[PDB]
RNA sequence: UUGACCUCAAAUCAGGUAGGACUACGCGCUGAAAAUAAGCGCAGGAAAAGAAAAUAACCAUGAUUCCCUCAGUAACGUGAAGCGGGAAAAGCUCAAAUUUGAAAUCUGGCAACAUUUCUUUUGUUGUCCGAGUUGUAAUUUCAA
RNA sequence: AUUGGAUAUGCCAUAUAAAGCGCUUUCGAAGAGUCGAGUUGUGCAGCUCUAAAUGGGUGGUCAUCUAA
């Protein structure tokens, strides 16, 4: 749950709506390093925070939210509503 | 004088308390130092500092 | 030895605190961080001291003359101080370590802080005396400090300290923080 | 436990914020008249009268009598049974209290009175229920605290011109004309079973 | 901001924390003088919201009055007479015990350049604001003398409007 | 015509922070003398005696009612 | 008089009409470096830039500085 | 029948107020002496068939009429943050009150601030 | 052994301010045989009130004050208020949200430079000390 | 002889800024020994007790206002 992005990042490198935008923004720009860049980029952070809002809303009490935020690249789960 | 009872803080709250986004103030170089800098340059040009 | 009315007031007040049955929220502010970790905490803090009003000008003149003749940086790293500013940081979970002055005069100010920092999971300690915390920030007094983010060079030192505050402050006491102080 | 020495009849009294002095005296006089009634402080709400049922359960009261003062001049008296039961709302005007020297009747406090009901009460189906409820509430329960076994007062209920003329006897002083308006199947609300 | 926590903590005036502090503080003040200056507000949020700023010109005084008019109203007039060069802004309740009620009284200096130049308290420098507490113009003064918008709250009666062409 | 909400009528709804700040103070401050007495009576299940005590203290039934569920939830959380 | 007030009014609006403002030397370089590298019409791309767009100017102001250059 | 109010100053109060009108507009010539008030319905059953001058135009009246709150008080159009349009009748009666006003208005240009550089 | 502060002092310390008078009208408080007189405190050229914890029950009104009307009505001999007509009209400011990529703020000393009802008045600029993070500025005031 | 406010014109100007209004895939902090309940003195005040958050106040379930 906290390594979903890492598997995709590794697999894509080996074989080289808002959530889709968030993936492209990080891929163009590119775990602590991933969390560092997002927390240090204003435009990227807005996309990442939006991505967690869509994925959590699209998917409720079963998923580990804290691990879900780590998948996107944030230190802690943001104060998203639902 | 009963022992302290923590009926709320026994758990750790993962989300931040506030929901508002981060204004771009905290990512761009300070605007307030810019007023100070441009006022500082002006005195230098006009011969005050 | 006829004491002045204010010497009598100072000492009777001190005796009164140790005699009464102090509530647990005020009782925790009497069992504080040890001395060895206290100097170690401030060894790190004195790297991230905010620049003085003397330095903040001498720096800004250098940019002004650079602009005035002919002419961008990195985020300034320092320590976060101020009650409202720090209390916000814990709630926003931007604080890595909170150091609470042990002797704030109206104790209403910090009495809720250990509960709040425990609630958000921010490692905290109650450092002895405010005037120590005051000198870190170039002030007479600081009710509370907080480390929010340090450079990668000192990221290992902060992690080492945080585990010490866990083991020396929160691992110890903990249960004693839930007993009514005083009554001695 | 649930109840020690449970009396047959228990009553509760509530007052309105905006009751005049004359309205205040009437509640005070009737409260002293009925030994099986417990007086309680004001209820804040004006249309949320459902709270009375929980209060009566709290005080183990079988009958609730809410004195409602409308526009600070009138008085609307509502009487209902504790568990469910029918709620009768009526406007009580033409009221005379013990502060009137025109009646000089004297009786011991807490004495159980004798109720005389007019035959017009049983003539109508709606009035029959009102007469029985009033008789049950007015009747001092046996073994009631501070009650007097001796009887020295007589209460007469008559249905004349659609207004109940409250008469207590030598008159005591309490003389009111109550105009029954609506009877609700529930307690202080619910379906309406009668209209004026 | 801590002033949110402090205000919601000043509501519980009999909890374990408040009870200890009340008895501890009410003892301190009773040793000190009846009207003694405070180096800071003992309620840094209530004073904050009534018009106190931590800046030169703003003065806090603490006063106790026996129990048994309005105590807050006497707290104004007794301190307003004590510091006779200072304007009385507001005041608030800090503590009470079986005999006294303690208040703190916010005062400002009309003569101070940090006050005379800030356009949010310039008004109290004006002459019309001399001894507001002595004329029922503080909040406890306006509340006490019925000043209030609503239905809840002389010469117009006993005169003759004897017009010209009547 | 339907009218957009006047922001004064929003007053008193709640906040995510103001609720949170009120929860912390409830734990930190402790409980008043009467709240200690009321709480003990709930644990002993003398609720009818407990609720009638609250109304005597506060003054109105809704105020007395509201405080009871504040303490009972505190009991369950504890 | 009303006719006189009218022609006087529209006269002053004409004399004080050039509300357009130039770009200071800093801005002249500031927008040029952004346009020399992100084409000219991709105002969303320049906003997302973190190095050249240090001030974090929004897209609406980037166009404002663009049209101000001409 | 104690202290009396006698109106011998009625004719001199008539002129004192006339001179105040004369003094005022002479200070602000081109602009009218008074602001425009809306037309509102009295709040009763004895008076709801009549039209009378209000206190100012509500937020929505100016928004539809084409002036914002800040520029509406400069040109002399009082705003009324209390009053609100409960029916489309009052909206249209007062929207076209400002329409004729903004047509008869000649806002004189002010002095601009033009820095030497951008 | 040396220092931070906290609280408390003292000074013919540097600079300031308060008192007393007048009292027709103002605002309180106290109060008789009328909420009067007398008493007491406090202001200004006006004071007070004042931008709704307001009315109403409408097709709704829209800070305050004042005049006419309401009306000798209502309520309980006392004695309203809303609506209605007029006079005048002007609105606004804080506390409570992190400036946190920078206490951005202010008193004072000195040094200059101007200005002036004015050599008497009023400031700006630099500079040093302090105030202040237990919160001084910018921002926001529910109409949002 | 002092001055009020505009007008014309000159010289400086920190505009690396500040402000209004469309739009929102975001949020919206709001004043406590005070409201209030019991009693007492003549709406306010004293004592005893002591709140809440679509909450609270005031009107006739709706309306209206948003105190300290």
PDB file of C-alpha atoms in Angstrom, chain C:
ATOM      1  CA  UNK C   1      15.726  38.835  59.756  1.00  0.00           C
ATOM      2  CA  UNK C   2      12.615  40.752  58.723  1.00  0.00           C
ATOM      3  CA  UNK C   3      12.109  39.815  55.100  1.00  0.00           C
ATOM      4  CA  UNK C   4      10.705  42.266  52.553  1.00  0.00           C
ATOM      5  CA  UNK C   5       7.081  41.701  51.645  1.00  0.00           C
ATOM      6  CA  UNK C   6       8.168  40.464  48.211  1.00  0.00           C
ATOM      7  CA  UNK C   7      10.850  38.028  49.386  1.00  0.00           C
ATOM      8  CA  UNK C   8       8.198  36.481  51.620  1.00  0.00           C
ATOM      9  CA  UNK C   9       5.838  36.422  48.635  1.00  0.00           C
ATOM     10  CA  UNK C  10       8.393  34.687  46.396  1.00  0.00           C
ATOM     11  CA  UNK C  11       9.306  31.971  48.887  1.00  0.00           C
ATOM     12  CA  UNK C  12       5.833  31.248  50.258  1.00  0.00           C
ATOM     13  CA  UNK C  13       4.611  30.840  46.683  1.00  0.00           C
ATOM     14  CA  UNK C  14       7.399  28.356  45.970  1.00  0.00           C
ATOM     15  CA  UNK C  15       6.547  26.366  49.102  1.00  0.00           C
ATOM     16  CA  UNK C  16       2.850  26.419  48.198  1.00  0.00           C
ATOM     17  CA  UNK C  17       3.397  24.702  44.843  1.00  0.00           C
ATOM     18  CA  UNK C  18       5.244  21.754  46.386  1.00  0.00           C
ATOM     19  CA  UNK C  19       2.575  21.330  49.079  1.00  0.00           C
ATOM     20  CA  UNK C  20      -0.680  21.418  47.111  1.00  0.00           C
ATOM     21  CA  UNK C  21      -2.072  18.526  45.061  1.00  0.00           C
ATOM     22  CA  UNK C  22      -1.019  19.745  41.616  1.00  0.00           C
ATOM     23  CA  UNK C  23      -3.248  18.574  38.732  1.00  0.00           C
ATOM     24  CA  UNK C  24      -1.633  16.100  36.321  1.00  0.00           C
ATOM     25  CA  UNK C  25      -1.509  18.583  33.435  1.00  0.00           C
ATOM     26  CA  UNK C  26       0.491  20.981  35.605  1.00  0.00           C
ATOM     27  CA  UNK C  27       2.352  18.129  37.320  1.00  0.00           C
ATOM     28  CA  UNK C  28       4.179  17.144  34.129  1.00  0.00           C
ATOM     29  CA  UNK C  29       5.942  20.521  33.991  1.00  0.00           C
ATOM     30  CA  UNK C  30       7.956  19.615  37.102  1.00  0.00           C
ATOM     31  CA  UNK C  31       9.606  16.428  35.778  1.00  0.00           C
ATOM     32  CA  UNK C  32      11.622  17.657  32.822  1.00  0.00           C
ATOM     33  CA  UNK C  33      14.414  16.746  30.426  1.00  0.00           C
ATOM     34  CA  UNK C  34      17.706  15.704  31.987  1.00  0.00           C
ATOM     35  CA  UNK C  35      20.836  17.834  31.757  1.00  0.00           C
ATOM     36  CA  UNK C  36      22.919  15.759  29.329  1.00  0.00           C
ATOM     37  CA  UNK C  37      20.202  15.662  26.684  1.00  0.00           C
ATOM     38  CA  UNK C  38      19.403  19.326  27.353  1.00  0.00           C
ATOM     39  CA  UNK C  39      22.833  20.503  26.217  1.00  0.00           C
ATOM     40  CA  UNK C  40      22.669  18.068  23.298  1.00  0.00           C
ATOM     41  CA  UNK C  41      19.298  19.462  22.231  1.00  0.00           C
ATOM     42  CA  UNK C  42      20.698  22.995  22.328  1.00  0.00           C
ATOM     43  CA  UNK C  43      23.889  21.953  20.555  1.00  0.00           C
ATOM     44  CA  UNK C  44      21.759  21.282  17.477  1.00  0.00           C
ATOM     45  CA  UNK C  45      19.433  24.242  18.043  1.00  0.00           C
ATOM     46  CA  UNK C  46      22.357  26.661  18.121  1.00  0.00           C
ATOM     47  CA  UNK C  47      23.091  25.710  14.520  1.00  0.00           C
ATOM     48  CA  UNK C  48      19.645  26.860  13.337  1.00  0.00           C
ATOM     49  CA  UNK C  49      19.419  30.169  15.174  1.00  0.00           C
ATOM     50  CA  UNK C  50      17.483  32.778  13.170  1.00  0.00           C
ATOM     51  CA  UNK C  51      19.649  35.639  11.979  1.00  0.00           C
ATOM     52  CA  UNK C  52      19.574  38.751  14.146  1.00  0.00           C
ATOM     53  CA  UNK C  53      18.116  42.080  13.094  1.00  0.00           C
ATOM     54  CA  UNK C  54      21.755  43.113  12.709  1.00  0.00           C
ATOM     55  CA  UNK C  55      22.475  40.282  10.263  1.00  0.00           C
ATOM     56  CA  UNK C  56      19.127  40.583   8.475  1.00  0.00           C
ATOM     57  CA  UNK C  57      20.097  44.124   7.462  1.00  0.00           C
ATOM     58  CA  UNK C  58      23.774  43.658   6.596  1.00  0.00           C
ATOM     59  CA  UNK C  59      22.634  40.848   4.298  1.00  0.00           C
ATOM     60  CA  UNK C  60      19.830  42.853   2.690  1.00  0.00           C
ATOM     61  CA  UNK C  61      22.108  45.819   1.985  1.00  0.00           C
ATOM     62  CA  UNK C  62      24.358  43.478  -0.007  1.00  0.00           C
ATOM     63  CA  UNK C  63      21.443  42.609  -2.290  1.00  0.00           C
ATOM     64  CA  UNK C  64      20.458  46.280  -2.504  1.00  0.00           C
ATOM     65  CA  UNK C  65      23.879  47.360  -3.742  1.00  0.00           C
ATOM     66  CA  UNK C  66      23.861  44.388  -6.119  1.00  0.00           C
ATOM     67  CA  UNK C  67      20.547  45.650  -7.499  1.00  0.00           C
ATOM     68  CA  UNK C  68      21.705  49.282  -7.432  1.00  0.00           C
ATOM     69  CA  UNK C  69      24.715  48.490  -9.645  1.00  0.00           C
ATOM     70  CA  UNK C  70      23.754  45.382 -11.622  1.00  0.00           C
ATOM     71  CA  UNK C  71      22.448  41.891 -10.919  1.00  0.00           C
ATOM     72  CA  UNK C  72      18.182  32.960  -6.816  1.00  0.00           C
ATOM     73  CA  UNK C  73      18.833  31.424  -3.398  1.00  0.00           C
ATOM     74  CA  UNK C  74      17.891  28.506  -1.148  1.00  0.00           C
ATOM     75  CA  UNK C  75      15.217  28.275   1.513  1.00  0.00           C
ATOM     76  CA  UNK C  76      16.418  29.778   4.819  1.00  0.00           C
ATOM     77  CA  UNK C  77      16.793  27.070   7.449  1.00  0.00           C
ATOM     78  CA  UNK C  78      16.268  28.091  11.068  1.00  0.00           C
ATOM     79  CA  UNK C  79      14.251  27.268  14.187  1.00  0.00           C
ATOM     80  CA  UNK C  80      10.547  28.004  14.585  1.00  0.00           C
ATOM     81  CA  UNK C  81       9.491  30.012  17.622  1.00  0.00           C
ATOM     82  CA  UNK C  82       6.401  31.786  18.837  1.00  0.00           C
ATOM     83  CA  UNK C  83       3.402  30.220  20.533  1.00  0.00           C
ATOM     84  CA  UNK C  84       0.812  30.763  17.792  1.00  0.00           C
ATOM     85  CA  UNK C  85       3.260  29.938  15.018  1.00  0.00           C
ATOM     86  CA  UNK C  86       4.439  26.742  16.705  1.00  0.00           C
ATOM     87  CA  UNK C  87       0.979  25.558  17.801  1.00  0.00           C
ATOM     88  CA  UNK C  88      -0.072  25.877  14.165  1.00  0.00           C
ATOM     89  CA  UNK C  89       2.968  23.886  13.041  1.00  0.00           C
ATOM     90  CA  UNK C  90       2.176  20.908  15.279  1.00  0.00           C
ATOM     91  CA  UNK C  91      -1.410  20.868  14.026  1.00  0.00           C
ATOM     92  CA  UNK C  92      -0.139  21.103  10.451  1.00  0.00           C
ATOM     93  CA  UNK C  93       2.312  18.314  11.413  1.00  0.00           C
ATOM     94  CA  UNK C  94       5.237  20.360  10.088  1.00  0.00           C
ATOM     95  CA  UNK C  95       7.188  20.125  13.368  1.00  0.00           C
ATOM     96  CA  UNK C  96       9.777  17.410  13.995  1.00  0.00           C
ATOM     97  CA  UNK C  97      10.505  18.186  17.661  1.00  0.00           C
ATOM     98  CA  UNK C  98       8.925  20.591  20.160  1.00  0.00           C
ATOM     99  CA  UNK C  99      10.732  21.987  23.207  1.00  0.00           C
ATOM    100  CA  UNK C 100       8.465  23.503  25.849  1.00  0.00           C
ATOM    101  CA  UNK C 101       9.715  26.036  28.378  1.00  0.00           C
ATOM    102  CA  UNK C 102       9.185  24.566  31.826  1.00  0.00           C
ATOM    103  CA  UNK C 103       8.270  27.724  33.749  1.00  0.00           C
ATOM    104  CA  UNK C 104       5.928  29.871  31.650  1.00  0.00           C
ATOM    105  CA  UNK C 105       4.309  32.354  34.008  1.00  0.00           C
ATOM    106  CA  UNK C 106       0.583  31.981  33.185  1.00  0.00           C
ATOM    107  CA  UNK C 107       0.746  28.214  32.804  1.00  0.00           C
ATOM    108  CA  UNK C 108      -2.434  28.317  30.708  1.00  0.00           C
ATOM    109  CA  UNK C 109      -0.215  28.975  27.699  1.00  0.00           C
ATOM    110  CA  UNK C 110       1.554  25.614  27.488  1.00  0.00           C
ATOM    111  CA  UNK C 111      -0.599  23.397  29.719  1.00  0.00           C
ATOM    112  CA  UNK C 112      -2.342  21.961  26.648  1.00  0.00           C
ATOM    113  CA  UNK C 113       0.866  21.543  24.632  1.00  0.00           C
ATOM    114  CA  UNK C 114       1.992  18.054  25.782  1.00  0.00           C
ATOM    115  CA  UNK C 115      -1.483  16.677  25.074  1.00  0.00           C
ATOM    116  CA  UNK C 116      -1.613  18.269  21.621  1.00  0.00           C
ATOM    117  CA  UNK C 117       1.899  17.150  20.663  1.00  0.00           C
ATOM    118  CA  UNK C 118       1.047  13.654  21.876  1.00  0.00           C
ATOM    119  CA  UNK C 119      -2.169  13.808  19.840  1.00  0.00           C
ATOM    120  CA  UNK C 120      -0.410  14.674  16.576  1.00  0.00           C
ATOM    121  CA  UNK C 121       2.534  12.389  17.359  1.00  0.00           C
ATOM    122  CA  UNK C 122       5.174  15.135  17.552  1.00  0.00           C
ATOM    123  CA  UNK C 123       8.100  14.166  19.837  1.00  0.00           C
ATOM    124  CA  UNK C 124       8.230  16.800  22.559  1.00  0.00           C
ATOM    125  CA  UNK C 125      10.253  17.620  25.652  1.00  0.00           C
ATOM    126  CA  UNK C 126       9.921  20.118  28.487  1.00  0.00           C
ATOM    127  CA  UNK C 127      13.273  21.892  28.552  1.00  0.00           C
ATOM    128  CA  UNK C 128      14.316  23.678  31.730  1.00  0.00           C
ATOM    129  CA  UNK C 129      13.846  27.466  31.799  1.00  0.00           C
ATOM    130  CA  UNK C 130      12.557  29.830  29.122  1.00  0.00           C
ATOM    131  CA  UNK C 131      15.621  32.084  29.120  1.00  0.00           C
ATOM    132  CA  UNK C 132      17.646  29.232  27.621  1.00  0.00           C
ATOM    133  CA  UNK C 133      15.104  29.029  24.808  1.00  0.00           C
ATOM    134  CA  UNK C 134      15.127  32.822  24.627  1.00  0.00           C
ATOM    135  CA  UNK C 135      18.830  33.068  23.811  1.00  0.00           C
ATOM    136  CA  UNK C 136      18.555  30.601  20.920  1.00  0.00           C
ATOM    137  CA  UNK C 137      16.300  33.024  19.046  1.00  0.00           C
ATOM    138  CA  UNK C 138      17.895  36.267  20.315  1.00  0.00           C
ATOM    139  CA  UNK C 139      15.017  37.173  22.623  1.00  0.00           C
ATOM    140  CA  UNK C 140      14.576  37.640  26.348  1.00  0.00           C
ATOM    141  CA  UNK C 141      12.338  34.577  26.529  1.00  0.00           C
ATOM    142  CA  UNK C 142      10.646  31.922  24.401  1.00  0.00           C
ATOM    143  CA  UNK C 143       7.603  29.993  25.573  1.00  0.00           C
ATOM    144  CA  UNK C 144       8.204  27.225  23.015  1.00  0.00           C
ATOM    145  CA  UNK C 145      10.616  26.269  20.239  1.00  0.00           C
ATOM    146  CA  UNK C 146      10.158  23.741  17.457  1.00  0.00           C
ATOM    147  CA  UNK C 147      12.455  22.132  14.901  1.00  0.00           C
ATOM    148  CA  UNK C 148      10.534  21.806  11.643  1.00  0.00           C
ATOM    149  CA  UNK C 149      13.176  20.893   9.055  1.00  0.00           C
ATOM    150  CA  UNK C 150      16.975  20.679   9.088  1.00  0.00           C
ATOM    151  CA  UNK C 151      19.534  20.352   6.328  1.00  0.00           C
ATOM    152  CA  UNK C 152      20.536  16.878   5.178  1.00  0.00           C
ATOM    153  CA  UNK C 153      23.910  17.284   6.916  1.00  0.00           C
ATOM    154  CA  UNK C 154      22.255  17.475  10.349  1.00  0.00           C
ATOM    155  CA  UNK C 155      19.308  15.216   9.517  1.00  0.00           C
ATOM    156  CA  UNK C 156      21.133  12.336  11.201  1.00  0.00           C
ATOM    157  CA  UNK C 157      21.847  14.336  14.361  1.00  0.00           C
ATOM    158  CA  UNK C 158      18.195  15.343  14.756  1.00  0.00           C
ATOM    159  CA  UNK C 159      17.082  11.729  14.342  1.00  0.00           C
ATOM    160  CA  UNK C 160      19.597  10.701  17.004  1.00  0.00           C
ATOM    161  CA  UNK C 161      18.287  13.358  19.401  1.00  0.00           C
ATOM    162  CA  UNK C 162      14.629  12.512  18.765  1.00  0.00           C
ATOM    163  CA  UNK C 163      15.249   8.905  19.786  1.00  0.00           C
ATOM    164  CA  UNK C 164      16.913  10.198  22.957  1.00  0.00           C
ATOM    165  CA  UNK C 165      13.961  12.425  23.873  1.00  0.00           C
ATOM    166  CA  UNK C 166      11.749   9.394  23.293  1.00  0.00           C
ATOM    167  CA  UNK C 167      13.892   7.230  25.576  1.00  0.00           C
ATOM    168  CA  UNK C 168      14.796   9.847  28.209  1.00  0.00           C
ATOM    169  CA  UNK C 169      11.593  11.923  28.404  1.00  0.00           C
ATOM    170  CA  UNK C 170       8.613   9.975  27.057  1.00  0.00           C
ATOM    171  CA  UNK C 171       9.789   6.403  27.667  1.00  0.00           C
ATOM    172  CA  UNK C 172      10.657   7.452  31.197  1.00  0.00           C
ATOM    173  CA  UNK C 173       7.971   9.223  33.214  1.00  0.00           C
ATOM    174  CA  UNK C 174       4.944   8.635  30.967  1.00  0.00           C
ATOM    175  CA  UNK C 175       3.054   6.983  33.819  1.00  0.00           C
ATOM    176  CA  UNK C 176       4.277   9.589  36.318  1.00  0.00           C
ATOM    177  CA  UNK C 177       2.759  12.262  34.057  1.00  0.00           C
ATOM    178  CA  UNK C 178      -0.661  10.816  34.956  1.00  0.00           C
ATOM    179  CA  UNK C 179      -0.330  11.271  38.735  1.00  0.00           C
ATOM    180  CA  UNK C 180      -1.288  14.373  40.685  1.00  0.00           C
ATOM    181  CA  UNK C 181       1.900  16.210  41.547  1.00  0.00           C
ATOM    182  CA  UNK C 182       2.709  17.825  44.828  1.00  0.00           C
ATOM    183  CA  UNK C 183       1.156  16.817  48.107  1.00  0.00           C
ATOM    184  CA  UNK C 184       4.645  16.575  49.601  1.00  0.00           C
TER     185      UNK C 184
END
